[PDB]
Symmetry: C4
Subunit: 252 residues, 4 copies
């Protein structure tokens, strides 16, 4: 299976952290980590309400610091007790941890720089904070199976997007040209109709009464029909791969 450190004071810690099935403290650590991740998600979502829209006051920052403290401590402990370091860098869960710590530390760095004395950079850094949800993949078999299913089916995703792109261009061009005589048309240019074509091929539904002529309606009917085919073509392969990777674990 997986090698052990073969030491007096490392096998115990490695079993405690890596394998939650050995001892009661391991189960406790697992539950604690799950609760901390959920708390961080809730804080990230609630921080942006219009009511609330650098310590002591603004209690929300007292909580993000606690979460980052626990995440960093756990990462360091997992790093020190590990036999191989090349495998440690090669794993995926480890990159994810390094990404969560970063946003907080970079923010503390600019706060200090401005304390001695762009908006796009800060907005991008704030968007990168979402990846703390992917840290749940260490505790659920479903997310790991989904990862394998997606990594084994890249060709089909490529074909799906390629077919969608071809259909979008074809039908947006057709409906722009078949509806340009009237002045009471929302479609002013071909790139304006792109949205209209990606929301009726997938049958989400535009909502507005955008095609108004008769050619517009004939083209819309063809679009609605052809979306079904060019979406249903590459889906069975992905479904079959998921089924295989899902039943293999439990029944094999």
């Amino acid at each position: 299976e997986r090698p052990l450190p073969r030491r007096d004071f490392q096998r115990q810690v490695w079993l405690l952290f890596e394998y939650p099935e050995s001892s009661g403290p391991a189960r406790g650590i697992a539950i604690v980590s799950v609760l901390v991740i959920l708390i961080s998600i809730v804080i990230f979502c609630l921080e942006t309400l219009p009511e609330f829209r650098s310590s002591f006051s603004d209690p929300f920052f007292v909580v993000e610091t606690l979460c980052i403290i626990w995440f960093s401590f756990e990462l360091l402990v997992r790093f020190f007790a590990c036999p191989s370091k090349a495998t440690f860098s090669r794993n995926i869960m480890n990159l994810i941890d390094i990404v969560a710590i970063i946003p907080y530390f970079i923010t503390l760095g600019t706060e200090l720089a401005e304390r001695q004395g762009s908006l796009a950079i800060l907005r991008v850094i704030r968007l990168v904070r979402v990846f703390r949800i992917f840290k749940l993949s260490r505790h659920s078999k479903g997310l790991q199976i989904l990862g394998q299913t997606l990594k084994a089916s890249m060709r089909e995703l490529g074909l799906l997007i390629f077919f969608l792109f071809i259909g979008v261009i074809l039908f947006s061009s057709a409906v722009y040209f078949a509806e340009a005589d009237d002045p009471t048309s929302g479609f002013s240019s071909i790139p304006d109709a792109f949205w209209w074509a990606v929301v009726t091929m997938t049958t989400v539904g535009y909502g507005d009464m955008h095609p108004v002529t008769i050619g517009g309606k004939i083209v819309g009917s063809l679009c609605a029909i052809a979306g079904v085919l060019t979406i249903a073509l590459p889906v069975p392969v992905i479904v079959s791969n998921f089924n295989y990777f899902y039943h293999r674990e439990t029944e094999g």
Copy 2:
């Protein structure tokens, strides 16, 4: 099969009520019970029209009392003629009966208390009255098969809801951050966009023209595409379980 009371004056009644296939009176009782349940459903639905929005007058209460009388009588008869009582408590159809009688009796209790001398409690009790429809599960094989299919596929339902939750958070966050510069945006916070993400992943369709920028439209396209995959993944298992439990009875 199923044990009988082995008595002079119980096997007849037990056959009359439990097994509608034995004698003509059993079939008559079955049809009577079906009609009563349908009447109760119609009364429950019609009671809330704005035209009509404690005896003699308000004829609707003359009818609910009749329905409750028949339900209680049938439950008592079924309880007395039954060999095992632990099985009687362990069955499911029996809990359902106990729940239908309750709303009426509790309402009579508060009417008497106020007759000698919250809205939330009464509203909750009124909502609990819906479960009289599940009493049809004693007369249709379809509802029983559906119950078995759902009880044999809890893991897949859990995975469906988990994948939906992850996708909702990811895409609502992305579309809030990619559309916050403009003041002409309906999305004021991440929890505001939650609805928008559960209605385009499932392709029901929002209806409003909510994404207005270009990043909003790119994110919407990705959302519409990815909903299809994360919904289609766990559905074949449930379909296969239903097919098995459905054909097993008729062809086995």
Copy 3:
């Protein structure tokens, strides 16, 4: 196979009309009949435009009379040349013919009665005229296969409608009760929400922003999810039956 009249002057006519594959005149008759049916459909649809909204003038009636003349002539010819009359009454295509002639003759009867001297009756008779499209089922194998597929799958259609009815009642009741406190709610009664529940379970999409509270949105999410399951359950059986009846003819 199928018995012949075994006569000097009937086998020829029966081959000409019943079997379009024998002689060139049979193919000509088939094409003529198809053209007449298409003309009648176009007349029926165009008669109701607002521009046009009992002989000589109103040329449309010159055409319906021609179509009815040909239909009646063909029916009589098919009836006289046929070995068995019990089979003639037992067939389905024959009932369809009798229904198309009727609307025209009844209209001529009331015109004569009023000529010597309700709106609901006339509207119903006008609605019954649609069934001339089903006369195409004599010339397409697809329509016949569809008829067999539907007649072999009545149980599944029943289960589909039963599950839909249960879901509609459950979710309309829930969303009415979870959204009644506010005055800015479109749902005034449970029968008012019925439509809202049949258009999000099937994912057609309401279009209006009808649920406005938070309970309304949670219930809407559950409705959108559960419609998928209770629709996908009984569809594979119908698909399999169609596939069987479709490939049986060509490859068997």
Copy 4:
């Protein structure tokens, strides 16, 4: 396999152009051609923005001329180095090339005619320019597989469109007649409701609250239900054909 010209100065050129796998220059030519096609698509789409809405100035025409130059050169080179000419005319990719050159040359012809001295003709010629996207089918295996899948499944497409046409007529007629008494009805004639029936059978969703009576809503429910069946019937055959043609190449 495929015959070679068997010549001193033709096998080299034929290998360079026809087979991109032989030599590095062949790969370079392939990438150059892909870039040129993408550039032409982008120009065709961007030409129609309202900002921009015969040489030197109007730089966009400097670019279309370059693209047409390369396309024509490549077509001539491919034509001269080819063993069989009947096969050259019989191929499909060749017709596609001839169609792209044409729009530009015809436009130059009318510009010269008017230079010495309808809108519908020019609009049609502008619409025909879309087919430059199909020139990508020489470089992707997905598009070729899609072409084979569509050419092997014409009967099922015919059946799909036939069933859709029958359903559309039936339900549009029913909803027009069941909703004509009221004056507050958007449906003025049967051909007015056609659109409403093709957008709820496919579950795209109309968006407007068009059915207002009770018969309108019952008919709408039946329409939403029946669209699912008459769309799902012929889709598995097409999916199976695509799967066969897709896996045959890689695993056979």
